[PDB]
Design a protein around this motif. Structure first.
Motif, mmCIF file in Angstrom:
data_model
loop_
_atom_site.group_PDB
_atom_site.id
_atom_site.type_symbol
_atom_site.label_atom_id
_atom_site.label_comp_id
_atom_site.label_asym_id
_atom_site.label_seq_id
_atom_site.Cartn_x
_atom_site.Cartn_y
_atom_site.Cartn_z
ATOM 1 N N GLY A 9 0.799 -1.205 0.000
ATOM 2 C CA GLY A 9 0.000 0.000 0.000
ATOM 3 C C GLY A 9 0.839 1.265 0.000
ATOM 4 N N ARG A 10 0.140 2.390 0.172
ATOM 5 C CA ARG A 10 0.816 3.683 0.209
ATOM 6 C C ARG A 10 1.759 3.780 1.401
ATOM 7 N N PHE A 11 1.333 3.281 2.561
ATOM 8 C CA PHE A 11 2.160 3.331 3.758
ATOM 9 C C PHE A 11 3.175 2.195 3.761
ATOM 10 N N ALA A 12 3.955 2.084 2.690
ATOM 11 C CA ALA A 12 4.970 1.047 2.591
ATOM 12 C C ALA A 12 6.186 1.411 3.430
ATOM 13 N N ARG A 128 15.274 2.872 6.859
ATOM 14 C CA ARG A 128 15.831 3.039 5.528
ATOM 15 C C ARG A 128 15.537 1.814 4.666
ATOM 16 N N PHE A 129 15.697 1.987 3.359
ATOM 17 C CA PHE A 129 15.459 0.907 2.409
ATOM 18 C C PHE A 129 16.256 1.121 1.128
ATOM 19 N N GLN D 54 1.140 5.898 -6.058
ATOM 20 C CA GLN D 54 1.119 6.308 -4.653
ATOM 21 C C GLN D 54 1.760 5.216 -3.795
ATOM 22 N N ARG D 55 3.062 5.042 -4.003
ATOM 23 C CA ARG D 55 3.838 4.063 -3.256
ATOM 24 C C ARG D 55 5.301 4.474 -3.292
ATOM 25 N N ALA D 56 6.080 3.892 -2.383
ATOM 26 C CA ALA D 56 7.511 4.160 -2.349
ATOM 27 C C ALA D 56 8.163 3.689 -3.642
ATOM 28 N N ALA D 73 16.091 -5.841 2.164
ATOM 29 C CA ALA D 73 16.691 -4.909 3.112
ATOM 30 C C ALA D 73 16.493 -5.376 4.548
#
Lengths: 129, 98, 70, 87, 66
Positions: A9-12, A128-129, D54-56, D73
């Motif tokens: 989702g958006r809150f990844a 972080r990623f 709408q994503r990272a 990661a």
RNA sequence: AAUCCGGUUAAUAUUCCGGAACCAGAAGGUGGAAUACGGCAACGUAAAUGAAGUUGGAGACGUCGGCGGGAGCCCUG
């Protein structure tokens, strides 16, 4: 109270804490859902040289309360529990956006107090990623 | 529908989420209920003339309603005959603003 | 060429100076097509009701150039 | 060239613009989903929402690659933490 | 007896929920799947056969010799 | 990166005429929101900060054969 991370989702890549588990199933979410409140905007690294308004602005954090499935979530060894974080999670808050908005405001206030107290530093710091 | 797909006017009176809005079937008035505990009452006259745009203005702002669990006014009903509003709160209290 | 189905919007469009002229074309289907040419688009409104078309013509802005069927 | 019929009953050969290729994911290389497939110049007018998900890392890599990168990661972080503790 | 959930979604559903008592991840399975199974096994003290059905995710043992 | 139709000459048309659009760039003005969002999901909306630095896609790609979709020519009522 168990710390969890959202990989969908958006809150990844956002760490959340399970305020109320819905893994038993629900009509709205026919899966292992979980209504949890997490942090989207981690507080900035506040510097003592900054002003009091500057410190609070950097230390400000934007919380986010949402319901996600167990598969979409990821358990973590760390866990944080708060007195105000128990019993405030319910379908009525999700159903009523004003109740949700107050829930988001209260969760952010509790998280800000946690950040101010220096607790939950790993959760407060964005991953972080 | 005869003006545009976009709204003819916008309002943000409620301090909380706007729960519902009701327009009286007969009386030229409309009511909006929200979880903030404040109900806004507006009087609107709509004319069939092409050049006569709908003139809608607020008429009253109901207050003094209890708020529980960040929920105030939930359901608002207009009287079938007069401009009387029946508002039911989260505490089981129904206020009939005649 | 952007057909408009909102009578009030067409009146508002005529109210603004963007409109240049308005042509009322009488079609075979007895429907009045009020075509108003603006700077960036052509606004055409087709009204089947003659009385509504007559009211629209009467209520049109005086500055607008009303044109008969070509 | 594309042949068309004019309103004056005339056959007109009209130029045909090349079909736009949808953007490809950075990691996997597969074309991205949820975005228009037009020319680079044509896609410019689209808004940020219409151009990025709408994503990272949205708009540069696939969601499946994003989940894989997040998982990789996390595994690397756990391995590094364990290695640091052992050392 | 110990019906297998070998695959991609069935194995993950059994392993994540803890249904899979024994896991035999073959060499052909993705390393991420093996690592996630290792993480799941560490969080629940599960049996990881780790065979050298991409990942044999047995819900139980029953008559199994393991 | 971005234009078509119809008409117009002794000799001219995507150029001229009449009508209708598109592109790029430019400022300020108005209004809208602004002090981003929902769905387990792929994804979607009228908006929805991003320096240095880092990365990617498109542009920008070999050849042949068969199949599906459409268009036009031709055929036919």
């Amino acid at each position: 109270g168990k710390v969890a991370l959202i990989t969908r989702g958006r809150f990844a890549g956002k760490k959340v804490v399970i305020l109320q588990a819905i893994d038993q199933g629900s009509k709205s979410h026919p899966f292992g859902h979980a209504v949890v409140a997490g942090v989207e905007r981690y507080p900035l690294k506040v510097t003592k040289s900054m002003g009091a308004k500057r410190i609070a602005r950097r230390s400000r954090v934007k919380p986010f309360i949402k319901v996600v499935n167990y598969n979409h979530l990821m358990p973590t060894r760390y866990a944080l529990e708060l007195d105000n974080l128990k019993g405030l999670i319910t379908a009525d808050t999700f159903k009523e956006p004003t109740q949700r908005s107050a829930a988001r405001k209260t969760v952010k206030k509790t998280f800000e107090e946690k950040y101010q107290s220096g607790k939950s530093a790993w959760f407060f710091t964005p991953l972080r990623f | 529908l005869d003006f545009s797909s976009k709204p003819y006017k916008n309002l943000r009176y409620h301090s909380r989420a706007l729960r519902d809005v009701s327009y009286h079937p007969s009386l030229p008035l409309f009511c909006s209920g929200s979880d903030d505990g404040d109900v806004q009452v507006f009087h609107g006259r709509v004319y069939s003339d092409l050049l006569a745009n709908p003139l809608i203005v607020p008429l009253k702002i109901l207050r003094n309603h209890k708020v529980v669990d960040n929920v105030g006014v939930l359901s608002t009903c207009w009287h079938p005959k007069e401009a009387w509003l029946f508002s039911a709160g989260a505490g089981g209290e129904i206020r009939m603003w005649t | 060429p952007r057909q408009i189905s909102d009578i009030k919007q067409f009146l508002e469009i005529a109210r603004r100076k963007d409109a240049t002229s308005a042509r009322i074309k009488k079609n075979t289907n007895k429907d009045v097509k009020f075509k108003l040419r603006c700077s960036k688009y052509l606004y055409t409104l087709v009204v089947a009701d003659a009385k509504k078309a007559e009211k629209l013509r009467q209520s049109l802005p005086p500055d607008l150039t009303v044109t008969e069927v070509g | 060239t594309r042949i068309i019929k004019t309103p004056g009953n005339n056959i007109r050969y009209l130029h045909i613009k090349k079909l736009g290729t949808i953007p490809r994911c950075g990691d996997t290389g597969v074309p991205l989903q949820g975005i228009p497939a037009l020319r680079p110049r044509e896609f410019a007018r689209l808004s940020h929402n219409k151009k990025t998900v709408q994503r990272a890392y949205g708009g540069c890599l696939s969601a499946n690659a994003v989940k894989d990168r997040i998982v990789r990661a996390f595994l690397i972080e756990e391995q590094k933490i364990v290695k640091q503790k052992l050392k | 007896s110990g019906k297998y959930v070998l695959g991609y979604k069935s194995t993950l559903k059994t392993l994540r929920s803890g249904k899979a008592k024994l896991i035999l991840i073959a060499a052909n399975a993705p390393p991420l799947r093996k690592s996630e199974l290792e993480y799941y096994a560490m969080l629940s003290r599960c049996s990881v056969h780790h065979y050298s059905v991409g990942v044999l995710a047995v819900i139980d043992a029953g008559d199994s010799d393991i």
